[PDB]
Structure formats: structure tokens, C-alpha cells
């Protein structure tokens, strides 16, 4: 409209509404120019490229981008508590985004005729980085002004060195909107049908599904002896009930496994080398190996066991001011897959056992441990938990085929996920016009709620503030005024029957 | 096909109207595997989930309707008229689901028995004898029910969720016949079972019953693998092989509960479904181990058990007389292939559990108040018919 | 039917991140302070540009049934007739039948094209095109933790030589 | 092997300030918390303070809080404790502890790190006396 | 307000079992891992048992340890001439955001 009348309002708050909340966020960012207006190949070899497993080959595009992909954005720590203490499941219906109040700056005074361009990409053209859980997002506390993160893309590598079916993608050859001060934009997204995210824990276990009093009409094999001696071999069959539940038939069985070398907290109770890499579970992927990271959704420890936790196995986040590189065990948070130990095994434990030959007369009988299990007929499993400061969706890989698309870091799987906002300055004039912009943001989701009508007597368990006093208050800033986040705090906390 | 089958039934007081906490240090303790913790409730329930209740000596469910009627109450023996005995159905599926389990307490395959119906009792989670903060605790009267007298009936309708057919027929051709040509389906998938032979001179003279057996561990507590997945009992030409706990044991008409010989029991064989199946206890095949070289042989190695690859096919576990129609479906994330282990057709939603219990009748109070809730109860029982009635659609 | 797809990746599974970005995910990197006896520590880094095989992943590549590994160039094999008794079978009512082509997987690493499955293709066209998304044929899929460490016990792991399908796999199906 | 060598005995008057050093050497410094506890010579254990394995945060008993002062020293492998404006009632024996449990576990319910010292000094006896 | 309170003394003779228990409030027991130290006189405590009913590498099976609600509790079996020594039962308490010992049980041997 012009120069002196504002393009758009601050809008901050949740709306709880029946069976729907609706969270609506507004930040304040500021975007530099990258790569001084350029695109330049990266690979490993600018940085020496030390290992084959490491090896890359990529552009770094003058583009930024915006991340919302983590539900801290979207949720306030008391809306977070009243979503997972009242719900069974949710999951993101609509999405609505905005950009406006635009400033552009000269290196200090505004430039009134700069204009800033941004596009989405709906048709899902460019490498799709926002699965991968970057650093970059919105602030969780909105009086944060937060950097906008560079894009940045790679492609089919040989050592450094790129192959003929490389691709390279200039953001140029896009449409886009240029923006100045007083433009505004917006868009709609509407995100496609995901089933609920399962926000509860089950009251009951695989194997104790049965009723406690009455005997099965099937029988198994008790004995295969008389006693001590010689030709005692015999055929016993007791039939299975109530004081043997171990044997009894059952017609599920628990979800797949591939198995994670535990480390235990208490660090004397470790091994005295180094297993970190070198005990690690991992995959091959064209001779790259690869951790296996998180992997699949996999029970933390066994009950009474909390010291022990899966090598790659689990989430593990960084507390406020943290640093990068081999930071104490104190610094950091390791959360728990506890909840999903009814239906699914122990990320640390074997599968189980199988028969490995053929008993005789000659032959005892033999198993061995499956250390690996994947899907059978007959399983049933839990995903991955989602945190507050964990991602919220991923993309789905563009593939003939795929099983069970949850993605291994928790969340929605998507074959289309909500649109990359491509964002960048457009230069001033190899000599440019020292520049950078600043503006809002605003995005609001439209959420869906799944209600709990549960029969449990008993009262349940709920997430709770700790009621003893304290030097700070959790969630909330310091005297330096430094919000941060104390812990971890998963979705599951209500119960459902298996 | 349609069904209908009315049996006449007696429910007693259980627990003397009573929940109870039990576990298996109520019952002595055990071990690990064994531990459990859960309820038993005064309420009883019934079963139908077994085809000789239905059946006389593809298809599959389609319609259901259950009646319940000519109630008699008696107290301990006279008739009590004024006394109701309350029943509801779990429509919701709010209550924990033991019909999946293959219990005892069948309406019987005889029309003219007289049966028992079974006590109802669930189980939560367990730390040991103990209950973590997360075991939930269920009073069945917290539930609407009908309140029926001698003259009221029950009836109810239910309506069974889209299933695939189950199939009754044995194929022709075997997978392989459709050795080193390509072929654009492999067997499905096995998880070895040890073998036993029914001539007892051929099996190792030792104890392996439990040491020898397939089993899959929870929460570190291990269950056996039982039946498991579908696979072929035995190879061709092979009759005296099962699984050690890949098949379905029936016993015989009066045969006891513990160490029966093998004359009391009746062992199922899946040997029809051995052309796209895997024997049981077979290896599925064989993998290389290794890279060949000028220095180094081609090394081989025993795939004892193979998740689903792409291009499996497989049948499922046939259904039997004796054996239980429908199992509901864990509620959970995820599942492949939901079909129930021990055979029949896995339903998210399936016949609703039938819950019973005589009304308590309190025996005289005394005469000044006292707060205690009434331990004293007349002696009674009460008895009627049922009636379901399935429409099979058939193929 | 769905759509035969013709296209190849031009990125492959574990390369999709943003090159030039932290994560806010870390890794267990140092379990040993160094050179000394009871040396014992946890050290967590964050992952990132630097070292990508650490990463946290949302996806995983495809099933694998390990086919053994033949050379073109017939000095490279060894001396032995291993046509049938190197191969990789599947057994149905005690009847061995030869695993061709068997599942959907890479032919041979990127730079190496001499060598071939020997029952996993069809024939000799190569696959190259799907070891974006799915193991090589002649390759373990990866390994797995096969103990508990302790303070005795040092870790261990195992190759997996075959896996079957797990939440979160993609993979490609062969070109026609 | 693991030993934590506790300082010597001192002798102190009221009102002067007592510094008792606390020298590990076996394993990794930098790796474990210390914790400090007092008994007097009668008396049950109390708890006085604790360091992280970085030595950035320190967490003191309530009624120490003002007069005490703990610092670890990552050269020389030592922790630090110290007691200002003595008492009569401060006699006692200082044990410095090592505590293995390095993270925190975040379960349903309140966080909490376990809190058990495998490790002890011998201990030092300050005497607080006229 | 919080208190970790254990009986002062008890007593028994070699073969028999010994509990010793403690009283704690909702902000250290109720919510927080408890652990047991055992102290010979003129030397310094022991770890017996840590996270309620671990038990460190080097300590012998007999030792027992439970948490029950906001109670904790050692059991000794077994019992022998070397075991009598002062036990005490410690939690991080919440409150006083401090760890918290109780008063020490002093167990004597009978003979």
C-alpha cells in the first residue's frame, strides 16, 4: 500500500475449540544476504573431505528459508500440557502463512526502492530439506528475533567429485514475489490426510492380553522326558492357563527390532575403550555406511532399568547454551521410548530366540538369538513419540514403494508436506550494495483433536510443573533474560487399553 | 449361510459380588515370565467365539444377533422373583478384550449341554506382583446395563466390519512349479520352529521343551512362539514331524489338564498350505556370507528366519471346528497383515463382549446403623437360554 | 496399476539434508576420556555438515537378500565351481529353488562395474540406477549390536546379511 | 586405581575460614560430580555442597549457602571446599565423594539425576576450638 | 518440612534377617531414587544399594532394598558379625534442592 501504514498485524495466541485448537505465531527475523548474491558448489573436498562415509557433493544457493517443522513453534508449554493431558491423538489439518512488514536496510539507514523476493515451491521441484531436523526454526519464546538459515541442496556424489545424473538447480528459474516495503505475503496450505498421531501409553502388554482365570483349550508340549536315565523320551502335553501365561497361544506378536549396543549412565559400568562409532548399529548405502539413527521405534530400557539407554537409539537434545562439540552428559537431555515398551521390544535386547537345527536321537536341540527381526504377519507396533522440541512432519520419499511411511524421528509422513519458503534479498549493484531486511512473520495451524472416553477408574498420569520452590521458573526467562527449556516433555501420558 | 443356536446356561456369584486384586504372587509367585497383575471381577461373560457353537458336524461373517431370555433366578433352592440379574454389552470397547484369547467356557458344539458361563478377569501392566502408576483399574458397574427379572429378555444386533474371505481351499500348483529359473514370487516368510517326531525313540533323550523353543521377548520377560507364523507343519512324505509349538493341539473328549499322552490330544497339520508356505521347521534358504576371490570360496549361511520381502505371498492359518472364529485387533500405531495367529479373522471392531452378573441380595441387616458396606448375601443363581444367530456369506 | 517409474534419483537416502546446517540433535561421539585406566566419559557432539554419517535420518533403504558377488573379469574368481553351491536359494517342501532375480537391489558399488549378483539380475543388465535408495546386492545391509557391553565385556556387532522390511524403508523396484 | 586423597588435619579458631583440598587421580577428572558431606564426630552424615563434572555449576546445602565455597581445580585434579566464619558446631570430618551417575533421566513425572557416591576420601578432621 | 527419619537402632543374631526402613516425605522418597550407605566406624560409608534396589559391582547379594511409597527400606540377610555398622538412607529432596541423609541406624549384632 505505501511506505507509512503497516501490512500486517501481530498475531499470537491458541484458540481451543471442541475437537480442534487452532495456534497462530508471529515472530520477528531478519535475513542477510548469502554467498554475496551467489551460487557456489560445495563438496567435502572444500572442507578436505576426510571420510568416504562423509563424502558429499552440493550448491549452496543465496536463498534463506523458513522452518516452522518443530512443535515448540506452534505450542506455548501450557498449551503443550493441555493438548497431551486431555488427548489421545491430534494432528495438523490447515496451515496459514504470512510475510509482511518488510524493512530493508543499508550498511545504518532504510532503502525505500529494495525489494525482497519470495516463492514456495507447491509442485515440490527442490530438494526438500526440511525433513532432516536443522537448526533454523522459530524461536519458542516470541519475543526472540531469530536468523533466517541459508538453503542449501545435494546431489548424486562420487568421492567429491559429481556424476553425469547430478543435478544442479538454480531458485532463479522460479517465479516469485518481490516485496517491498509496504507488500505483503500469504499463503494456504491444506495438509493431506495423516492418521493420529497416538498421544497415550497402553494399560496393557502383548503377552498379558488374556483372561487371568480361565484356561486356554489348547495344549503344548510339557515334557519330552520321563526322568533321569536312558530312553526316557516321552510326549506330554499339559494345556495352558492361568499359572503358565509364558506358553499360552497367543494371536499377536510384538513389532520389529534391530538391535542398539546400550551405554549406561553411570559411566563406570561401561566398557573402557572406544565403541561409540566402532559398536555402533548402522546401514550400507552404496558403500557409505550410515548410523542407524534413531532407527526404528524400539522400547528405551527394560522396567527398573533407567540408567541404560540405546547407543543410536534414541532423541537426545541440547539444553540452553550448549555447545557444539563433546559437551558433558549433564548438558544435554536423552529422552525415552519407555512408553511403547507393552507392544514393542527392547531397542537392546534380542528379538528372541529360533530353532537352529534339526533335534535327533544323536542332536540336542539348538537356538540361536534373532538379533534382527523384520516385519512378520501377525505384529503390531508403536511409532516413535513426538516431543515439544521435536520435528513435527517429514516428506515421504518419492519411491515405487514403501512400508509404513512414519518417519524414524516422529511425526506426520508425507508424500506432499507443507511447501519450502524461498526467501532472499534481490541485490543492488560483482560490486553490490551492502543490504540486509528484516520483517514478521506470522503462521497459524489448524490442528485436530482426538478425545479420550476412557472407563479407568483410577486417576491417570499427567504432565505437572514441580510444585517446590525454585531459583528460576521452568520455561520462563532468566534475570539475563535467557528463555529456555528444561526438559524433554513427550506427548504420552494417558492410557489406553491394547 | 444363517446359524442359530440356543443353549440354556447357569451364572453363580462370583467372588461373593466382589472385585479382587490378584497376581501372581496371589497365586505363589511364580517366576518372571509368569508375573501378572489385574482383577478379577463378579460379573461373567459369554463365548461364542468358537465355530462348533454355530456349526453342526470362502466364507465368511456378515450379520449378528444375540438374545437373552427365560430368566430364572434362584436362591440356595426356591425361586426369587423380585431379584434382576444385570447384563450390557462393551459397544465402546472400553473394557479389556479376552475373547481374542482362546479361552474355555464355549457355548458347547451339543445343544442339548447345560454350561457354566466363565468368570470375567483382565490383567494391567506389571513390574512383578506389583502395579506401576500407569495399571488402570476397571468397576464394571460404572457401565449402563439392563436390569432384567424373570418375565425381561436381552436381544442386541451387531454387524461384522468388512473382512476378506477366509480360504478353504488347497491349491494345485506350488509356488516353485508355477529350480534356477526366475520366478516373479518367492515363499513368505518363516520363523524356525524346533521339530519333534510322534515316534518317541527318534527325539533326544532330554529335557527341551522349553529350552528348545521358539520364543520372543518382552520387556524382558519371554513368551513362546505360539503357534507363530503360518507356516507348513511338516515336508511331503514327512507325517510324524510337528512344530514344537508351531501347531494347534486340541484334547480329546476327558482328557486331563496336565501330562496327557499324546493319545489325548488331537495335533493339527498345516500341510495343505505347503506349496506358497515354508516348512516350519525348515530353513527358509540360504545367503552368502561372504565375497568370493582368488584367495577366498563362496561361504554360505542358514536364514532361520526372514521378515516379508516384496513379492511374498502367503496363506494364512486354516480355521477348524473346534478352533475360534474372530480375535480383535491390538489397538496400535501399526500392524501388518492382522489376521490372528491362531487362525480366524481379525477384526478392529469385533463382536462386543457380554457382560453378566446377578444382582446382590442382602442378607437381613441389623437394626441400629453402621457404616461397613454389607457383607452378608442370600445364596443364589440364576439360569435362562441363549440365542445367536450369524449370517455367513460364502464363497 | 501404478505408474512404472523411469526416472533415477538424482539424490540418494542418506544425502537428503541441508548441507550448510547444524542439527539440534546430538550423538554419543567420545565414550572414552583416553590413554589411561578408567578412562570413562560421555561426550555428545552436535551433528552436522562436517559429519554426515551420523545424522539423524527419517527414512532407511530397502530390504536386502544377500546374492554373491561375481567378477567379469574371470581372473578375480576363485578357483571352484560355485555356480550352485555359492547360491543364494529360497526352500519350498524340501525343494531348493535358486533366489532370481530375487529382490530389487543395487547391481555393484558406484565405480566398480566388472562385478554382477550372480542369480540377482536378469540376463546382463546392471541396476545401478536404484543404489540411491536401496542396498547393494553383493553387501551386508549393515550391522547390529550382538552383546551388552560392560566394564568386562567389550561391545560387539554382527553384519546383517539379510533384512526384511521395517517401518520407514523405501526402495525402488526393477526397470523393465 | 581409583583413589581420592583427602587433605590433612587442621586446627582452627572461631571466625577464621578452613580450605580442604581434595585430590583424585585414576580416572577422568572432568567426568564425574563431587560431592562434600560433613559428620560431626557424633553425629549422622549431612551434605554440604556439589560440583558438576565442569565445574561451572555448584549447588549448596541452604544452610551453607553465603559461607561456603567450592572450586575444582582440572590442572592439579583437585576439588576445593571452603568454610568461612567458623563455629563450634563446624568440628567435624569432611568426606569428599565421587559420584558416577553422569545424566539425567526425563520419565514420566519429575526429572531427577541419581545421586549416589561410589568413590569417598578418607577424610579430613577440622577441629574448630579455643 | 522434609524429614528422612530411620529408627536409631536395631538388632539380630548371625543367620537371621534384618530390615531397617525410613520415613521420607513426598518431595525426596515419594519422587526422587534412593540410595543406602554403610558406615564401619573409623572409616567412610560404603554405597550398598543405589536407584532403590541396584546394588553396586562388589557388594554381596544379601542386601536387599525397596521403595514403597514415600518409605524406604534395606534388608539385610544372612546376617553376620561384619555387617554391624551404621546404615543410612539418602535421597535428593526437592524442597531443600540438596540431597538429604536420614539419621543413621546403628545395627548391632547379638553374642
Known amino acids: 500500500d505505501g511506505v507509512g501504514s503497516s501490512s500486517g498485524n501481530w498475531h499470537c495466541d491458541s484458540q481451543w475449540l471442541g475437537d480442534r485448537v487452532i495456534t497462530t505465531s508471529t515472530r520477528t527475523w531478519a535475513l542477510p544476504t548469502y554467498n554475496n548474491h551467489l551460487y557456489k558448489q560445495i563438496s567435502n573436498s572444500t572442507s578436505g573431505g576426510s571420510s568416504n562415509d562423509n563424502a558429499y557433493f552440493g550448491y549452496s544457493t543465496p536463498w534463506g528459508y523458513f522452518d516452522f517443522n518443530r512443535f515448540h513453534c506452534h505450542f506455548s508449554p501450557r498449551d503443550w500440557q493441555r493438548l497431551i493431558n486431555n488427548n489421545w491423538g491430534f494432528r495438523p489439518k490447515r496451515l496459514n502463512f504470512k510475510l509482511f512488514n518488510i524493512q530493508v536496510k543499508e550498511v545504518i539507514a532504510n532503502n525505500l526502492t529494495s525489494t525482497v523476493q519470495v516463492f514456495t515451491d507447491s509442485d515440490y521441484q527442490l530438494p526438500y530439506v526440511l525433513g532432516s531436523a536443522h537448526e533454523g526454526c522459530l524461536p519458542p519464546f516470541p519475543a526472540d528475533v531469530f536468523m533466517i538459515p541459508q538453503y542449501g541442496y545435494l546431489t548424486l556424489n562420487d568421492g567429491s567429485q559429481a556424476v553425469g545424473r547430478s543435478s544442479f538447480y538454480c531458485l532463479e528459474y522460479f517465479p516469485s514475489q518481490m516485496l517491498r516495503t509496504g507488500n505483503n505475503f500469504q499463503f494456504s496450505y491444506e495438509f493431506e490426510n495423516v492418521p493420529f498421531h497416538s498421544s497415550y501409553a497402553h494399560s496393557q502388554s502383548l503377552d498379558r492380553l488374556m483372561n487371568p482365570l480361565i484356561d486356554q483349550y489348547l495344549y503344548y508340549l510339557s515334557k519330552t522326558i520321563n526322568g533321569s536315565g536312558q530312553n526316557q523320551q516321552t510326549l506330554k502335553f499339559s494345556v495352558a492357563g492361568p499359572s503358565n501365561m509364558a506358553v499360552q497361544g497367543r494371536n499377536y506378536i510384538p513389532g520389529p527390532s534391530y538391535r542398539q549396543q546400550r551405554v549406561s549412565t553411570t559411566v563406570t559400568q561401561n566398557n573402557n575403550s572406544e565403541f561409540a562409532w566402532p559398536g555402533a548399529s548402522s546401514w550400507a548405502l552404496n558403500g557409505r555406511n550410515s548410523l542407524m539413527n534413531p532407527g526404528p521405534a524400539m522400547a528405551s530400557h527394560k522396567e527398573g532399568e533407567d540408567r541404560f539407554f540405546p547407543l543410536s537409539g534414541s532423541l537426545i537434545f541440547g539444553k540452553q547454551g550448549t555447545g557444539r562439540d563433546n559437551v558433558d552428559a549433564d548438558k544435554v537431555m536423552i529422552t525415552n521410548e519407555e512408553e511403547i515398551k507393552t507392544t514393542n521390544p527392547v531397542a537392546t535386547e534380542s528379538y528372541g530366540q529360533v530353532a537352529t537345527n534339526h533335534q535327533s536321537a544323536q542332536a540336542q536341540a539348538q537356538t540361536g538369538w534373532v538379533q534382527n527381526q523384520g516385519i512378520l504377519p501377525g505384529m503390531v507396533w508403536q511409532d516413535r513419540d513426538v516431543y515439544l522440541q521435536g520435528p513435527i512432519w517429514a516428506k515421504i520419499p518419492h519411491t515405487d514403494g514403501n512400508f509404513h511411511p512414519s518417519p524414524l524421528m516422529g511425526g506426520f509422513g508425507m508424500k506432499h508436506p507443507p511447501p519450502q519458503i524461498l526467501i532472499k534479498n534481490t541485490p543492488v549493484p560483482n560490486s553490490f550494495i551492502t543490504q540486509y531486511s528484516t520483517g514478521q512473520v506470522s503462521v497459524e495451524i489448524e490442528w485436530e483433536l482426538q478425545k479420550e472416553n476412557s472407563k479407568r477408574w483410577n486417576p491417570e498420569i499427567q504432565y505437572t510443573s514441580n510444585y517446590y520452590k525454585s531459583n528460576n521458573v521452568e520455561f520462563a526467562v532468566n534475570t539475563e533474560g535467557v528463555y529456555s527449556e528444561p526438559r524433554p516433555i513427550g506427548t504420552r501420558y494417558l492410557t489406553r487399553n491394547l | 449361510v444363517i446359524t442359530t443356536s440356543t443353549r440354556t446356561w447357569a451364572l453363580p456369584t462370583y467372588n461373593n459380588h466382589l472385585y479382587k486384586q490378584i497376581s501372581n504372587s496371589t497365586s505363589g509367585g511364580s517366576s518372571n515370565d509368569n508375573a501378572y497383575f489385574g482383577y478379577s471381577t463378579p460379573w461373567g461373560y459369554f463365548d461364542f467365539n468358537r465355530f462348533h457353537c454355530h456349526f453342526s458336524p470362502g466364507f465368511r461373517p456378515k450379520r449378528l444377533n444375540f438374545k437373552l431370555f427365560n430368566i430364572q433366578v434362584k436362591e440356595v433352592i426356591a425361586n426369587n422373583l423380585t431379584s434382576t440379574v444385570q447384563v450390557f454389552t462393551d459397544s465402546d470397547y472400553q473394557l479389556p478384550y479376552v475373547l481374542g484369547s482362546a479361552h474355555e467356557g464355549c457355548l458347547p458344539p451339543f445343544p442339548a449341554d447345560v454350561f457354566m458361563i466363565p468368570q470375567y478377569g483382565y490383567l494391567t501392566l506389571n513390574d512383578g506382583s506389583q502395579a506401576v502408576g500407569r495399571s488402570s483399574f476397571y468397576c464394571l458397574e460404572y457401565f449402563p446395563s439392563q436390569m432384567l427379572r424373570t418375565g425381561n429378555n436381552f436381544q442386541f444386533s451387531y454387524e461384522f466390519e468388512n473382512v476378506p474371505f477366509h480360504s478353504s481351499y488347497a491349491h494345485s500348483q506350488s509356488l516353485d512349479r508355477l529350480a534356477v529359473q526366475g520366478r516373479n514370487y518367492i515363499p513368505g516368510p518363516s520363523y524356525r520352529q524346533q521339530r519333534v517326531s510322534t515316534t518317541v525313540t527318534q527325539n533326544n533323550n532330554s529335557e527341551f521343551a522349553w529350552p528348545g523353543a521358539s520364543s520372543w521377548a518382552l520387556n524382558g520377560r519371554n513368551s513362546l512362539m505360539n503357534p507363530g507364523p503360518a507356516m507348513a507343519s511338516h515336508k511331503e512324505g514327512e507325517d510324524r514331524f510337528f512344530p514344537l509349538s508351531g501347531s494347534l493341539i486340541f484334547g480329546k473328549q476327558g482328557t486331563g489338564r496336565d501330562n496327557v499322552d499324546a493319545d489325548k490330544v488331537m495335533i493339527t497339520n498345516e500341510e495343505e498350505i505347503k506349496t506358497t508356505n515354508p516348512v516350519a521347521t525348515e530353513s527358509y534358504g540360504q545367503v552368502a556370507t561372504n565375497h568370493q576371490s582368488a584367495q577366498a570360496q563362496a561361504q554360505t549361511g542358514w536364514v532361520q528366519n526372514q521378515g516379508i520381502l516384496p513379492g511374498m505371498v502367503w496363506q494364512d492359518r486354516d480355521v477348524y471346528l473346534q478352533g475360534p472364529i474372530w480375535a480383535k485387533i491390538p489397538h496400535t500405531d501399526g500392524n501388518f497383515h492382522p489376521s490372528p495367529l491362531m487362525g480366524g479373522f481379525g477384526m478392529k471392531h469385533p463382536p462386543p463382549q457380554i457382560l453378566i452378573k446377578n444382582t446382590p441380595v442382602p442378607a437381613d441387616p441389623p437394626t441400629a446403623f453402621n457404616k461397613d458396606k454389607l457383607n452378608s448375601f442370600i445364596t443364589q443363581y440364576s439360569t435362562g437360554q441363549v440365542s445367536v444367530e450369524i449370517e455367513w456369506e460364502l464363497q | 496399476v501404478p505408474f512404472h517409474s523411469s526416472y533415477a534419483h538424482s539424490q540418494s537416502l542418506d544425502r537428503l539434508m541441508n548441507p550448510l546446517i547444524d542439527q539440534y540433535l546430538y550423538y554419543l561421539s567420545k565414550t572414552i576420556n583416553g590413554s589411561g585406566q578408567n578412562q570413562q566419559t560421555l561426550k555428545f557432539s552436535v551433528a552436522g555438515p562436517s559429519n554426515m554419517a551420523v545424522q539423524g535420518r527419517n527414512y532407511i533403504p530397502g530390504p536386502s537378500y544377500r546374492q554373491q558377488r561375481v567378477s567379469t573379469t574371470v581372473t578375480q574368481n576363485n578357483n571352484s565351481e560355485f555356480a550352485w553351491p555359492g547360491a543364494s536359494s529360497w526352500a519350498l517342501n524340501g525343494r531348493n529353488s535358486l533366489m532370481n532375480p530375487g529382490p530389487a537391489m543395487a547391481s555393484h558399488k558406484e565405480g566398480e562395474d566388472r562385478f554382477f549378483p550372480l542369480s540377482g539380475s536378469l540376463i546382463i543388465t546392471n541396476e545401478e540406477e536404484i543404489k540411491t535408495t536401496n542396498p547393494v546386492a553383493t553387501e551386508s545391509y549393515g550391522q547390529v549390536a550382538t552383546n551388552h557391553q560392560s566394564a568386562q565385556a567389550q561391545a560387539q556387532t554382527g553384519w546383517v546379511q539379510n533384512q526384511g522390511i521395517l517401518p520407514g524403508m523405501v526402495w525402488q523396484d526393477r526397470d523393465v | 586405581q581409583v583413589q581420592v586423597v583427602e587433605s590433612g588435619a587442621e586446627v582452627k579458631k572461631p571466625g577464621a575460614s578452613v580450605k580442604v583440598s581434595c585430590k583424585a587421580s585414576?580416572?577422568?577428572?572432568?567426568?564425574?560430580?563431587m560431592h562434600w558431606v560433613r559428620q560431626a564426630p557424633g553425629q549422622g552424615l549431612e551434605w554440604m555442597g556439589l560440583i558438576n563434572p565442569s565445574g561451572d555449576s555448584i549447588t549448596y546445602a541452604q544452610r551453607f549457602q553465603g559461607r561456603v565455597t567450592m572450586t575444582k581445580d582440572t590442572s592439579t585434579s583437585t576439588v576445593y571446599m571452603e568454610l568461612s566464619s567458623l563455629r563450634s558446631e563446624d568440628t567435624a570430618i569432611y568426606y569428599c565423594?565421587?559420584?558416577?551417575?553422569?545424566?539425567?533421566?526425563?520419565?514420566?513425572?519429575?526429572?531427577?539425576?541419581?545421586?549416589?557416591?561410589?568413590?569417598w576420601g578418607q577424610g579430613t578432621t577440622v577441629t574448630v576450638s579455643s | 518440612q522434609s524429614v528422612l527419619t530411620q529408627p536409631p537402632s536395631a538388632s539380630g543374631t548371625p543367620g537371621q534377617r534384618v530390615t531397617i526402613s525410613c520415613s521420607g516425605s513426598?518431595?525426596?522418597?515419594?519422587?526422587?531414587?534412593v540410595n543406602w550407605y554403610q558406615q564401619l566406624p573409623g572409616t567412610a560409608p560404603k554405597l550398598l544399594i543405589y536407584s532403590n534396589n541396584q546394588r553396586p559391582s562388589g557388594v554381596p547379594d544379601r542386601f536387599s532394598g525397596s521403595k514403597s511409597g514415600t518409605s524406604a527400606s534395606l534388608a539385610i540377610s544372612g546376617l553376620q558379625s561384619e555387617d554391624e555398622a551404621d546404615y543410612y538412607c539418602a535421597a535428593w529432596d526437592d524442597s531443600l534442592n540438596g540431597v538429604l541423609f536420614g539419621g543413621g541406624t546403628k545395627l548391632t549384632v547379638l553374642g
Open positions: 513426598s518431595s525426596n522418597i515419594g519422587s526422587n531414587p
Open positions: 565423594a565421587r559420584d558416577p551417575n553422569v545424566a539425567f533421566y526425563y520419565g514420566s513425572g519429575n526429572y531427577y539425576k541419581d545421586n549416589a557416591m561410589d568413590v
Open positions: 585414576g580416572y577422568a577428572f572432568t567426568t564425574y560430580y
